[PDB]
Amino acid sequence: PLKPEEHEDILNKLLDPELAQSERTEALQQLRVNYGSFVSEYNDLTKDLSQLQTEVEEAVQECRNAEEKAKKAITDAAMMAEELKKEQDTSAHLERMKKNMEQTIKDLQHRL
Amino acid sequence: ENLYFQGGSGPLKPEEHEDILNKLLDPELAQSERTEALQQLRVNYGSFVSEYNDLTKDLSQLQTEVEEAVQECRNAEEKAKKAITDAAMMAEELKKEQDTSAHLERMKKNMEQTIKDLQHRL
């Protein structure tokens, strides 16, 4: 888009009514094209901004999903860790009884 | 209700800008109405460039804001996958230990019956 000082210069060249009609129409073309392109680019950058805001919110919502999924996973892992410890104790106890009964069987086998 | 412009008007519409351009085309136009029309274009353009610059800087901040949000989302999703994989591993080891305990329970009864039979043989 034209800078305000360049727009002003076109305005001041158009201030002379003695200006040649070829440069008069040329300057009028400059303002016309510049303004049409300006409104187009303005509208373009406007919708770009509204979409970028939706882009932010979607990213934040994908972050809300991810952080909550992680937290649930961490809690479930801790719960299973507690349950695993209990089961390890049961297996250790059952292993010791297996050894005890293995020893008892050998004694019985030697006595028969 | 634009507050960048004179009055509550917003930017000139392309047809209104064009009408002013066609008023400056008249060689009979009064020099006072020529200066008036040039003033219209001047005020409108300065006010429009002001609002344009503001929405311009707004865009760069949303762009940095997007990437920071997406990268904090990349992190969060990576954290979640790490957590879920650890949860899966804990589930597998818990399943293995539950299988081991069931096996040992079956073995205990088997040996209990064996002991009884052997003891009855004494």
Helices A21-111 & A4-13 angle (0-180, nearest 10): 160
Buried residues in B20-38 as b, exposed as e (16+ CB within 10 A): bbeebeeeeeeeeebeebb
DSSP single-letter state for residue A19: S
> Using only C-alpha atoms, what is the Rg of chain A?
42
**Selected residues 39-58 of chain A with any CB under 8 Å from a CB in chain B:** 39, 42, 45-46, 48-49, 52-53, 55-56
The token pair that represents B103 in the structure block: 């096996």
A75 in B contact zone (CB under 8 Å): no
Q: Which of B21, B98, B107 sits opposite A98 (nearest CB)?
A: B107
Mention every residue, 6+ apart, whose C-beta is less than 8 A from residue A4: B45, B46, B49
Question: CA–CA separation, A13 vs A7, rounded Å?
Answer: 10
Neighbours of A27 (CB within 10 A): 18
In order of start, what are the domains of chain B with their CATH numbers?
14-121 (1.20.5.400)
The angle at the Cα of B77, spanning B73 to B80, to the nearest 5 degrees, equals: 140
User: Distance (Å) from the C-alpha of residue A33 to the closest C-alpha of chain B?
Assistant: 10
Q: Work out whether the CA dihedral B95, B100, B103, B104 comes out positive or negative.
A: negative
